[PDB]
Design a protein around this ligand. Structure first.
Ligand SMILES: CC(=O)N[C@@H]1[C@@H](O)[C@H](O[C@@H]2O[C@H](CO)[C@H](O)[C@H](O[C@]3(C(=O)O)C[C@H](O)[C@@H](NC(=O)CO)[C@H]([C@H](O)[C@H](O)CO)O3)[C@H]2O)[C@@H](CO)O[C@H]1O
Ligand SMILES: CC(=O)N[C@@H]1[C@@H](O)[C@H](O[C@@H]2O[C@H](CO)[C@H](O)[C@H](O[C@]3(C(=O)O)C[C@H](O)[C@@H](NC(=O)CO)[C@H]([C@H](O)[C@H](O)CO)O3)[C@H]2O)[C@@H](CO)O[C@H]1O
Ligand SMILES: CC(=O)N[C@@H]1[C@@H](O)[C@H](O[C@@H]2O[C@H](CO)[C@H](O)[C@H](O[C@]3(C(=O)O)C[C@H](O)[C@@H](NC(=O)CO)[C@H]([C@H](O)[C@H](O)CO)O3)[C@H]2O)[C@@H](CO)O[C@H]1O
Ligand SMILES: *[C@@H]1O[C@H](CO)[C@@H](O[C@@H]2O[C@H](CO)[C@@H](O[C@@H]3O[C@H](CO)[C@@H](O)[C@H](O)[C@@H]3O)[C@H](O)[C@H]2NC(C)=O)[C@H](O)[C@H]1NC(C)=O
Ligand SMILES: *[C@@H]1O[C@H](CO)[C@@H](O[C@@H]2O[C@H](CO)[C@@H](O[C@@H]3O[C@H](CO)[C@@H](O)[C@H](O)[C@@H]3O)[C@H](O)[C@H]2NC(C)=O)[C@H](O)[C@H]1NC(C)=O
Ligand SMILES: *[C@@H]1O[C@H](CO)[C@@H](O[C@@H]2O[C@H](CO)[C@@H](O[C@@H]3O[C@H](CO)[C@@H](O)[C@H](O)[C@@H]3O)[C@H](O)[C@H]2NC(C)=O)[C@H](O)[C@H]1NC(C)=O
Ligand code: NAG
Ligand code: NAG
Ligand code: NAG
Lengths: 170, 315, 315, 170, 315, 170
């Protein structure tokens, strides 16, 4: 991916995370917990759904028979029809392949991006009270209980509250 | 101590392609190329006509196999492989153009053209067209000399289209299996048929002689047609070897014509048809039949094109 | 204390679509599908011919409505709905092919073919073709027997193309409104017309009899044509029912032919035309008329496709 | 957007910024000021203009009449023409829609990117003398007057000059 | 003290285009539009036939220039600009359709149709078709009256196709350079030729008279053809002015037919051909010839489309 | 580029780096050295090769002659053929141009991305023992010999080893 989060600085995914697409894994005095992030999960899902919405949208263009499988039409017109049909088939086969390749590149990149955007949001939240491990983890200097961790996930963590001890705990 | 950011994954991921990589694994993906065929003609909510033994062009002239379809109404017309337009052997001029017209016609209705005859018989018949016995095309009159080898008087018959829609007018030129048969049916001498309207003009002469037998016959009846505009008049002038129309055909509305081997099914609904049945799909592409008609996904050469619906899968 | 990074915005943003989202708002956007039609034929800097009552094929044979266009030069040729090719009723064989040739011809110039006649009249005329009185096609000669019911001598006329460009050669076959009229114009007996060149050969016979009246006439004159290569010779051999060319046509250069209802306007400049006027645009796509000709944007089904020319709009 | 700057960590745009596309909003002892960034604004504009340049570039391919609205052509050829025309119309309609969707995705993403690139340039400039708020603002530890702020905008701010007091003002 | 991150570069970078910028420089790039033509027909691993002076249709009837190609097998058939189908002047009806059939035929094999003649000569000849002296089409018989101005008896000849593949059947109608010549070759009176099979019927009459000279001749022989289904029978009935087939043609398999000015080269291998030679390429696009055939890159209007194969080049 | 590394915060490329696509340039007590990064170089190369692989993949669709350069076919069919051929040529010319433009944008962006991803990997590695110059260089506080530098390149540098002196050397 372009952002190097998924299959990058984050070594692998969690098969146990069955609650969402992106999530948090925390360690404190009271142990370990894993929770899904709703907003990021929903952003990715909705983006992909928008792609599906665009692709399953049918055209209402009718086509009629131009030739005949039971009794062969005149060859002069027959040869032109066949040439034209083969040319159109080549165009659509090319179009389909290119569409799906572009969509797939971008789908992987947008999902990678969304992972990156969540990581970055957390880093900015933990202004100076923590630093980056490098495998997508934040080592928190100050002690941070289940309620402090929930404060990070619910996006209300107050940096200046725990500032003092964290920076002292350099 | 620590808070970690991550993403979901699965052991059983799905391969897709991108611009940069072939067979990259993702958490979920959906197929964009339809491969599922329904081996039926799904006709729910449509008035269908299953022509069976009746060839579509046969509906206009009426060999015995088309007696039940002389006037038909449909929005889906199904031609079948066993369909035959004729009984006495021959062919329609410009046949595929007429098929294209009839396929989208909504069906046909018939009206008498008002021709009556004196000085000739009207009841030409053949074992090739069987009802209770030897018979002929229901919509046509096989005109003959009153007696074997008798004089066929020079005749002229005219029909004006007084409807607001064009009339489909059919006539036949009979090529006897021999000169002796021609002279017997119509009397000796050169046979000439001339047909005109305001904008159409053509002359015809039979070339009698033995063709290979079809339906027991070595002669041929070749059919010609025109679409007669409102207020235009078609004139037939002839001295024999002429198969006259008794009735004209009028188109009823709109329809889709298909060719299919598949069995009718009034329970499933569909819009895209082909020889092998119905393609029922919301996908933009299909790899079933490049000649499918109606409202269809676009035909592509590829078997599969998987659209990624998830992130890269990293177990 | 603080420095903040940001971006511009507006309250009145414009909706666009992306691969991922329908109707996302952006600061600015431009339309890519042309909907603006000019209800004129914009002809600034072009030599135009507005045919009006003259049908394009009429220019080659010269019914009275085409007297002013017998020799014309143009790079834009406009056919009009009231255009009529004929005066005495009939049709051109392979008519649309000839129209396509004439549309891109750059116009036509005429040259006498040098035919002179003895033993027949040359001044056949009809009330269907009116000038000061009953008249005929200006470029053609209606050849008749010297007297009512008189003998029409077997004749042969030949024209060699001695120019370095192909000659357009037209002739007519006259179908009289009755046998009695045919015998009167040309004398009794079978009429045969044969035409050949080095590579062309065809024979013609009239089928006389009453067609529906057009312009008061129940006969028909059907026109046939060929392009005669440099140094090739066309030969006409006939005994009546023959409408002879007096002059041949030569193509002048290059042109675009259009069909339009729209009024000429010498003040606006344009390159893309259709029935309803001129499409003047730099956009790649248009939704005005799928049959527009000249140098045109590509026709698409959609009404609008907005191209984003700004960032996402966040008020 | 892929970079999460526009409609992301930057909550909204400034309707008052009528001087450019991207800009600076500062607060110091002497009050508040807002100024446009020329280079970033010009980068985005020029990129978008390049897209327009590509799209308004006409082809010089002529087309001629193949059928006739006043007198219907023969049906055998007529049916083929219609089938071919309808097929080509489908191709172009598809092409146009796909083009505009891809262009629009990328236009939004490049504009988002440009915002991100400017933010990041500033962060690297303010090496250790400031930290990230999280709503696209930099809280400067040392006092920074109008001329110091202009030094950031004109891209000549000397980090090591104000280093001492800023880091002391942790 | 310090560690720095960077990337490679070069002074001599290559320009490419993107959606956003024209002529951006990158470290490396590759061309996607083929401009390299090989001025040869690369035929390695293919059975070729270089027709030279022999026109492809000539192979079926056998003017002297086609004597070496009366039965040929090929998977690549090359038509040449000097190719001529005929010796005595004339043309094939529906000629391009027959060329398309022969181009993909894999070649042809011939079989005698078994016609023998009594009461007429079989040895019509002309200086237009030269072997040791005046001669004719090798596969055909120029049938004539036993003596100058003699009676040509009404005749009928029939051939049944007893093979499992269709038979290509050719016949000719001779248009004499004058009535006097027609009466001399075939006797006086009207000449009529009728041809039918189970599904085909047509009648023919010569129009004698002087055409411009080709190969010294003012007459013409026009050739007609049909594909005769297995078990179908073709019947010819005639009283003169008839060029009869001696042998029927059968198609051998599959082939590609090309038209080329380029010299054969058995050493290079190729799949895409045109007038000027062979396009040998793995690129998806080509700008050499829009009418190239075989397995080819797609023709595009552009001269060059450079695909970036490196990062932006910043010296 | 979207990531602003190449032709962005990295001022220019190194013509001397003939060993790879991305690399390291270091300065210490023992002098200067330049080495290529294999993984990043290989990632970019392989991505681009994947694009080439897709484009040189031939179709096996045969076309046959539909008209004739030695003897002109009938004009009715001839005009339709020409109209159809011109329409198909327009479609393919459009397709080719759009393909190459999209591929080229993305190729530049992925190469820019790869540069960014390597820079970021190093920054996370040098947790607190160094800070960002701004021209793609890391000023290392602690002294770092050739073996310490190699430890960065081979991706085994221990942050907590040199932590003490580096942070003291603020
Ligand atoms: C082996 C072979 O080729 N045999 C043919 C004969 O088939 C052919 O005679 C025709 O044979 C028919 C069945 O095979 C049938 O018996 C034909 O008779 C009828 C018919 O039913 O079609 C009898 C009808 O009474 C007659 N109708 C009228 O005359 C007017 O209503 C028709 C009509 O004459 C023909 O259909 C017109 O073509 O024929 C029988 O003629 C025989 C003569 O052609 O030649 C043998 O070689
Ligand atoms: C109601 C109905 O159908 N009536 C037709 C008559 O229309 C028709 O007679 C023709 O009527 C014409 C106007 O309607 C016109 O009067 C025809 O006369 C002329 C003509 O002007 O066309 C007179 C010319 O002198 C004559 N020219 C020559 O003979 C040589 O220059 C031409 C010429 O004979 C014809 O145009 C060739 O078709 O005719 C008049 O004939 C009538 C006979 O067909 O039949 C009625 O039923
Ligand atoms: C200047 C001009 O137009 N001259 C023509 C003459 O060309 C033409 O006479 C024909 O001239 C031919 C060479 O130019 C050749 O001599 C024709 O004679 C032959 C032939 O070789 O083709 C002689 C054959 O013996 C004869 N074959 C038979 O009769 C049966 O085998 C053929 C045959 O008659 C024709 O090919 C059929 O068209 O002709 C010679 O006829 C002359 C007569 O048309 O008219 C001059 O104006
Ligand atoms: C135009 O293209 C169509 C294909 O859409 C060609 O029709 C196909 O022709 C082939 C060969 O004649 C048919 O295959 C053959 O089938 C018969 C009987 O089943 C068998 O004897 C042969 O071994 C072979 O399998 C094929 O069925 C047929 N397809 C369709 C859909 O009709 C057609 O020939 C082309 N037209 C021209 C003028 O080239
Ligand atoms: C090929 O497609 C063209 C469309 O491009 C078809 O031409 C269209 O035919 C319809 C139906 O005949 C015309 O609409 C009708 O107009 C008449 C008179 O205005 C009216 O009586 C009917 O109620 C109906 O509105 C339509 O005008 C015409 N369009 C054009 C541009 O000519 C054509 O029929 C198709 N050809 C074949 C062989 O299917
Ligand atoms: C359909 O398109 C083809 C092009 O693919 C047209 O064929 C081209 O016609 C032009 C003009 O007749 C030919 O150019 C001319 O060549 C002759 C002799 O070399 C010369 O005298 C003229 O000055 C001019 O250069 C051109 O060679 C020919 N191209 C091919 C490939 O055959 C064709 O006319 C079009 N058909 C219709 C019906 O419009
Ligand atoms: C046909 O002729 C009658 C004659 O009165 C007229 O009422 C009708 O409107 C005409 N229809 C057309 C289509 O010309
Ligand atoms: C036509 O014939 C004359 C006869 O001398 C000759 O000068 C001219 O070049 C010929 N033109 C063509 C096109 O064959
Ligand atoms: C043709 O007729 C013979 C007659 O016995 C038969 O064996 C053969 O199978 C028939 N072939 C076809 C193709 O109908």
């Amino acid at each position: 991916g372009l952002f190097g989060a998924i299959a990058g600085f984050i070594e692998n995914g969690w098969e146990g995370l069955i609650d969402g697409w992106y999530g948090y894994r925390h360690q404190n005095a009271q142990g370990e917990g894993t929770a899904a992030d709703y907003k990021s999960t929903q952003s990715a899902i909705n983006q992909i759904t928008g792609k599906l919405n665009r692709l399953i949208e049918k055209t209402n263009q009718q086509f009629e028979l131009i030739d005949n499988e039971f009794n062969e039409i005149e060859k002069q017109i027959g040869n032109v029809i066949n040439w034209t049909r083969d040319s159109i088939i080549e165009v659509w086969s090319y179009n389909a392949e290119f569409l799906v390749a572009v969509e797939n590149q971008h789908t992987i990149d947008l999902t990678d991006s969304e992972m990156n955007k969540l990581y970055e949001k957390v880093r900015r939240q933990l202004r100076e009270n923590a630093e980056e491990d490098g495998n997508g983890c934040f080592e928190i200097f100050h002690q941070c209980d289940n309620d402090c961790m929930a404060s990070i996930r619910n996006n209300t963590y107050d940096h200046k509250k725990y500032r003092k001890e964290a920076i002292q705990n350099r | 101590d620590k808070i970690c950011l991550g993403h979901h994954a699965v052991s059983n991921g799905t391969k897709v392609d991108t611009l940069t990589e072939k067979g990259i694994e993702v958490v979920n993906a959906t197929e964009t190329v339809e491969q599922k065929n329904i081996p039926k003609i799904c006709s729910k909510g449509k008035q269908t006509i299953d022509l069976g033994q009746c060839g579509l062009l046969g509906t206009t002239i009426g060999p015995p196999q088309c007696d039940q379809f002389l006037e038909f109404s449909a929005n889906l017309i199904i031609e079948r492989r066993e369909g035959d337009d004729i009984c006495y052997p021959g062919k329609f001029d410009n046949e595929e153009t007429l098929r294209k017209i009839l396929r989208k016609s909504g069906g046909i209705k018939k009206e008498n053209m008002g021709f009556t005859y004196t000085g000739v018989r009207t009841n030409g018949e053949t074992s090739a067209c069987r009802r209770s016995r030897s018979s002929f095309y229901a919509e046509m009159k096989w005109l003959l000399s009153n007696t074997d080898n008798g004089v066929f008087p020079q005749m002229t018959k005219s029909y004006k289209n007084t409807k607001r829609e064009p009339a489909l007018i059919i006539w036949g030129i009979h090529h006897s299996g021999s000169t002796a048969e021609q002279t017997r049916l119509y009397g000796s001498g050169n046979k000439l048929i001339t047909v005109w309207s305001s904008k159409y003009q053509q002359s015809f002469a039979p070339s009698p002689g033995p063709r290979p037998q079809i339906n027991g016959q070595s002669g041929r009846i070749d059919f010609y047609w025109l679409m007669l505009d409102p207020n235009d008049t078609v004139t037939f002038s002839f001295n024999g070897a002429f198969i006259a129309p008794d009735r004209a055909s009028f188109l009823r509305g709109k329809s889709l014509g298909i060719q299919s081997d598949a069995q009718l099914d009034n329970n499933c609904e569909g819009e895209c048809y082909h020889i092998g049945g119905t393609i029922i799909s919301n996908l933009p592409f299909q790899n079933i039949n490049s000649r499918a008609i109606g409202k269809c996904p676009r035909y592509v050469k590829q078997k599969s094109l998987m659209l990624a619906t998830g992130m890269k899968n990293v177990p």
